[PDB]
Amino acid sequence: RTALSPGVLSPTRPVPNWIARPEYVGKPAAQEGSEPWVQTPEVIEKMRVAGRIAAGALAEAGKAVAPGVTTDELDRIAHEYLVDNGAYPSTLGYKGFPKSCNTSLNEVICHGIPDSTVITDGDIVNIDVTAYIGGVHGDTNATFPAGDVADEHRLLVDRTREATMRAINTVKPGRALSVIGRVIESYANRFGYNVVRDFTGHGIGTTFHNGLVVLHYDQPAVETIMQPGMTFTIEPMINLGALDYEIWDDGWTVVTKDRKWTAQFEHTLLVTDTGVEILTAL
Numbered sequence: 708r709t710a711l712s713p714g715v716l717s718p719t720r721p722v723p724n725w726i727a728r729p730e731y732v733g734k735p736a737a738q739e740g741s742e743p744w745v746q747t748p749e750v751i752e753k754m755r756v757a758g759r760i761a762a763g764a765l766a767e768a769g770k771a772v773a774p775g776v777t778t779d780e781l782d783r784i785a786h787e788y789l790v791d792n793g794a795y796p797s798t799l800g801y802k803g804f805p806k807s808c809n810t811s812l813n814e815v816i817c818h819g820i821p822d823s824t825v826i827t828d829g830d831i832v833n834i835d836v837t838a839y840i841g842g843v844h845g846d847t848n849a850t851f852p853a854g855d856v857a858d859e860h861r862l863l864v865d866r867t868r869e870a871t872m873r874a875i876n877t878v879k880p881g882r883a884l885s886v887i888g889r890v891i892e893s894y895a896n897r898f899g900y901n902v903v904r905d906f907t908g909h910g911i912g913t914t915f916h917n918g919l920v921v922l923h924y925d926q927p928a929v930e931t932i933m934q935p936g937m938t939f940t941i942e943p944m945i946n947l948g949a950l951d952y953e954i955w956d957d958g959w960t961v962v963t964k965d966r967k968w969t970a971q972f973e974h975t976l977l978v979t980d981t982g983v984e985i986l987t988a989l
């Protein structure tokens with residue numbers, strides 16, 4: 708299997724005018740990074756809607772992953788599901804991003820752009836979908852096997868899913884946020900994998916990325932304590948090889964320098980009065 712290189716994009720996909728756009732669409736930048744981390748009950752309930760829709764789009768696009776399918780096609784499918792459900796694809800026009808989801812194959816860590824790239828037998832394909840509806844965002848991602856995937860890569864996918872779920876299970880009010888990355892890194896190390904450091908989870912709500920950072924490695928110097936009504940993502944990227952990476956000239960696609968493959972899963976979470984709720988649930 709060759710290393711990937713950039714392909715070419717299809718034209719911007721339309722969205723019905725009556726689906727509300729985020730404030731940033733049609734601007735070079737968004738207004739974000741200073742929003743309260745704790746959401747109102749109003750916003751939380753709206754985030755359940757957005758999260759369900761994003762989860763559905765993810766699942767629909769996932770079902771389409773097969774050898775010979777292009778990553779643009781996956782984007783068409785995600786896009787159409789969002790629009791059929793009255794949601795806007797948050798990534799479309801975000802910081803100029805040209806598509807409605809991110810599609811990251813093999814050595815791509817994250818933020819791949821859907822394009823002419825053809826899925827080859829044996830690939831692993833992350834699809835990352837964010838829905839904006841009712842003035843709020845819901846963000847989820849999963850890595851899917853395409854055709855006859857090697858056991859090594861099947862296990863990498865399955866263990867990254869399980870790392871993510873284990874971390875989710877530790878979310879609790881009154882507990883340090885740092886527990887999340889402790890758990891992920893412990894589980895990744897169990898199976899000799901390496902957790903990506905420079906890319907993190909994030910607070911999300913009325914804005915796509917607020918100032919809250921969720922580390923996916925063990926960093927106990929973080930003092931933040933989880934509180935009820937906080938909303939954020941857990942989205943670890945887990946590598947078979949070294950952490951070193953490059954960013955392509957598109958400014959988005961992040962790739963391992965050694966070209967070994969890497970998997971990711973993501974949910975949007977709520978800290979409740981006593982525990983957690985996965986908002987991006989089918």
Ligand code: MET
Pocket residue numbers: 798801804809818835836837846940942973
């Ligand atoms: C083009 S922005 C993609 C952002 C991504 N969905 C995230 O989880 O942050």
Ligand SMILES: [Cl-]
Pocket residue numbers: 902903904905906950
């Ligand atoms: Cl890193």
Ligand SMILES: [Co+2]
Pocket residue numbers: 835836837846847848942973
């Ligand atoms: Co995402």
Ligand SMILES: [Co+2]
Pocket residue numbers: 846908909940942973
């Ligand atoms: Co995210």
Ligand code: NA
Pocket residue numbers: 811812813814815816817833968969970971
């Ligand atoms: Na990857």
